[PDB]
RNA sequence: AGGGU
């Protein structure tokens, strides 16, 4: 939605986390989001699925300032995914594999 | 780094 007045925070904010980074920010064992909840002192609970965007909405509840703090931890964790871990192939570098050569020997 | 409660 065109929320031109979305500059106002509150006691619990809805943060848009990329759907390809949902498990990332929480961690495979949830150890990661516990750190976010720890360093911010907030209750971060992923909602079912608002579906109103290419992201997932997570309701970071708690004291507004801490919600901002918590939001930053998740957002920065996304920002660090942006060419953070360098990958030669797969991304900006197509592996020059042959036409089935290597596996297609017959 | 896919599910933490």
From Swiss-Prot:
**Residue ranges of every copy of the KH domain listed in the record:** 10-74
Location of this chain's protein in the cell: Nucleus; Cytoplasm
Signal peptide bounds: none
Residues bearing PTM Omega-N-methylarginine:
99, 101, 103
Q: Where is the composition biased (Gly residues)?
A: 96-106
Tissue distribution of the protein: Detected in neural and non-neural cell lines.
Q: Residue ranges under compositional bias (Pro residues)?
A: 85-95
Sequence segments annotated as region (Disordered): 80-106
Q: What does this protein do?
A: Binds to the dendritic targeting element and may play a role in mRNA trafficking. Part of a ternary complex that binds to the downstream control sequence (DCS) of the pre-mRNA. Mediates exon inclusion in transcripts that are subject to tissue-specific alternative splicing. May interact with single-stranded DNA from the far-upstream element (FUSE). May activate gene expression. Also involved in degradation of inherently unstable mRNAs that contain AU-rich elements (AREs) in their 3'-UTR, possibly by recruiting degradation machinery to ARE-containing mRNAs.
Family affiliation: Belongs to the KHSRP family.
Domain remarks in the Swiss-Prot or TrEMBL record:
KH domains KH 3 and KH 4 behave as independent binding modules and can interact with different regions of the AU-rich RNA targets of degradation.
Assembly and oligomerization: Part of a ternary complex containing FUBP2, PTBP1, PTBP2 and HNRPH1. Interacts with PARN. Interacts with PQBP1.
Q: What is this protein called?
A: Far upstream element-binding protein 2
**Upper taxonomic lineage:** Eukaryota, Metazoa, Chordata, Craniata, Vertebrata
Q: What is the name of the gene encoding this protein?
A: KHSRP
Q: Which residues of the full protein are shown?
A: 317 to 418 of 711
């Amino acid at each position: 939605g065109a929320m031109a007045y979305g500059s106002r925070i509150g006691g619990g904010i809805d943060v848009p986390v990329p759907r390809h980074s949902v498990g990332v920010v929480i961690g495979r064992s949830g150890e990661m989001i516990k750190k976010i909840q720890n360093d911010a002192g907030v209750r971060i609970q992923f909602k079912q699925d608002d579906g109103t965007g290419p992201e997932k909405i997570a309701h970071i509840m708690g004291p507004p300032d801490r919600c901002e703090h918590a939001a930053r931890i998740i957002n920065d964790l996304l920002q660090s995914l942006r060419s953070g871990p360098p990958g030669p192939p797969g991304g900006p570098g197509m592996p020059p594999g042959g036409r089935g050569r290597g596996r297609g020997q017959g």
